[PDB]
Amino acid sequence: GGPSVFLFPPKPKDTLMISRTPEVTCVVVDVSHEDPEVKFNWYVDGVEVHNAKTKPREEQYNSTYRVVSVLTVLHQDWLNGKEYKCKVSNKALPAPIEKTISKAKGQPREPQVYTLPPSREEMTKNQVSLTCLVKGFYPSDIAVEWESNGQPENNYKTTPPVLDSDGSFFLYSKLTVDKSRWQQGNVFSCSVMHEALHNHYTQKSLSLSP
Numbered sequence: 001g002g003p004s005v006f007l008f009p010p011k012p013k014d015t016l017m018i019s020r021t022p023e024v025t026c027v028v029v030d031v032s033h034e035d036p037e038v039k040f041n042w043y044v045d046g047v048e049v050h051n052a053k054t055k056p057r058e059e060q061y062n063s064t065y066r067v068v069s070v071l072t073v074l075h076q077d078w079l080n081g082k083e084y085k086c087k088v089s090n091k092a093l094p095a096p097i098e099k100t101i102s103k104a105k106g107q108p109r110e111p112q113v114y115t116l117p118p119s120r121e122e123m124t125k126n127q128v129s130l131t132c133l134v135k136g137f138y139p140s141d142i143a144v145e146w147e148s149n150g151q152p153e154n155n156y157k158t159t160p161p162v163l164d165s166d167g168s169f170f171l172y173s174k175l176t177v178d179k180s181r182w183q184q185g186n187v188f189s190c191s192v193m194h195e196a197l198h199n200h201y202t203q204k205s206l207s208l209s210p
């Protein structure tokens with residue numbers, strides 16, 4: 001029938017750290033050998049731009065060609081809602097294919113970050129759960145990590161964002177540590193990246209209070 005276009009956003013962390021390079025990815029699949037030519041046009045807010053890096057086509061094991069084009073986006077443009085259009089032209093199509101993407105839309109809402117110590121009843125266990133509540137944020141793109149003086153604490157798991165009853169999102173992150181480390185008074189820190197925080201970052205700390 002005709003080829004199909006997919007347009008993918010940057011990775012969320014790449015949009016929240018100015019040191020990183022967010023990029024948007026236009027993928028064309030189902031390109032026939034009969035008309036194998038593929039032209040990309042990129043627009044930012046309706047204005048054609050020219051810095052996209054297209055990859056040379058690559059044949060698939062199902063006898064179709066796959067062509068990829070990558071446009072780097074500016075940290076501030078993406079956060080300011082600019083919209084990115086990929087236009088794919090190929091002989092086999094009646095009219096060119098237009099896909100548009102941007103950051104999740106909606107008024108931004110800054111998260112409230114709260115650490116919760118292990119439950120009393122959980123103090124019987126050889127491991128305990130440190131809880132980071134992140135609530136009230138909009139949009140849902142977010143990243144959460146845990147640290148203890150310098151090094152990342154990676155035995156943690158974070159729930160997906162959940163739509164709350166006021167239209168904002170919340171989640172929880174659970175860090176599991178040896179009960180000894182928690183009682184040795186060590187400081188544990190939940191750090192949160194989200195667009196609506198100052199510099200898109202905050203951290204909150206948790207320690208035994210005796």
Ligand SMILES: *[C@@H]1O[C@H](CO[C@@H]2O[C@@H](C)[C@@H](O)[C@@H](O)[C@@H]2O)[C@@H](O[C@@H]2O[C@H](CO)[C@@H](O[C@@H]3O[C@H](CO[C@H]4O[C@H](CO)[C@@H](O)[C@H](O)[C@@H]4O[C@@H]4O[C@H](CO)[C@@H](O[C@@H]5O[C@H](CO)[C@H](O)[C@H](O)[C@H]5O)[C@H](O)[C@H]4NC(C)=O)[C@@H](O)[C@H](O[C@H]4O[C@H](CO)[C@@H](O)[C@H](O)[C@@H]4O[C@@H]4O[C@H](CO)[C@@H](O)[C@H](O)[C@H]4NC(C)=O)[C@@H]3O)[C@H](O)[C@H]2NC(C)=O)[C@H](O)[C@H]1NC(C)=O
Binds near residue numbers: 066
């Ligand atoms: C012939 O073969 C080719 C490929 O060869 C095959 O290789 C694999 C795939 C084998 O399975 C086998 O087939 C062959 O060996 C086939 O090509 C495939 O075609 C199908 C369509 O038929 C495509 O399906 C869509 O996939 C989307 C998800 O794709 C991602 O995830 C899958 C794995 O789950 C991967 O396979 C893909 O490569 C994609 O991976 C993502 O790619 C991004 C770009 O690289 C990554 O982002 C980038 O990441 C880098 C670092 O890695 C940087 O961070 C960059 O900054 C960043 O931009 C991303 O991380 C990566 N993810 C992963 C996990 O790797 C689906 O989203 C899509 O769903 C759409 O369609 C469904 C129904 O059609 C439905 O669920 C939805 O409606 C959805 O539609 C979109 O949804 C939105 C919102 O809901 C709506 O608005 C729209 O409806 C719609 N719009 C848009 C714009 O999307 C499809 O399921 C498949 O991806 C593609 N494969 C490849 C490799 O390209 C071909 O079909 C075969 N043909 C025949 C006839 O056999």
Ligand SMILES: [Zn+2]
Binds near residue numbers: 048
């Ligand atoms: Zn031009």
Ligand SMILES: [Zn+2]
Binds near residue numbers: 049050
């Ligand atoms: Zn050009």
Ligand SMILES: [Zn+2]
Binds near residue numbers: 044072
């Ligand atoms: Zn931009």
Ligand SMILES: [Zn+2]
Binds near residue numbers: 015016022077078079
């Ligand atoms: Zn950005």
Ligand SMILES: [Zn+2]
Binds near residue numbers: 077079082083101102
């Ligand atoms: Zn945007």
Ligand SMILES: [Zn+2]
Binds near residue numbers: 083100
């Ligand atoms: Zn649009």
Ligand SMILES: [Zn+2]
Binds near residue numbers: 145
């Ligand atoms: Zn980090």
Ligand SMILES: [Zn+2]
Binds near residue numbers: 110196197198
């Ligand atoms: Zn603030």
Ligand SMILES: [Zn+2]
Binds near residue numbers: 198199
């Ligand atoms: Zn400042």
Ligand SMILES: [Zn+2]
Binds near residue numbers: 018075079199200
């Ligand atoms: Zn910024």
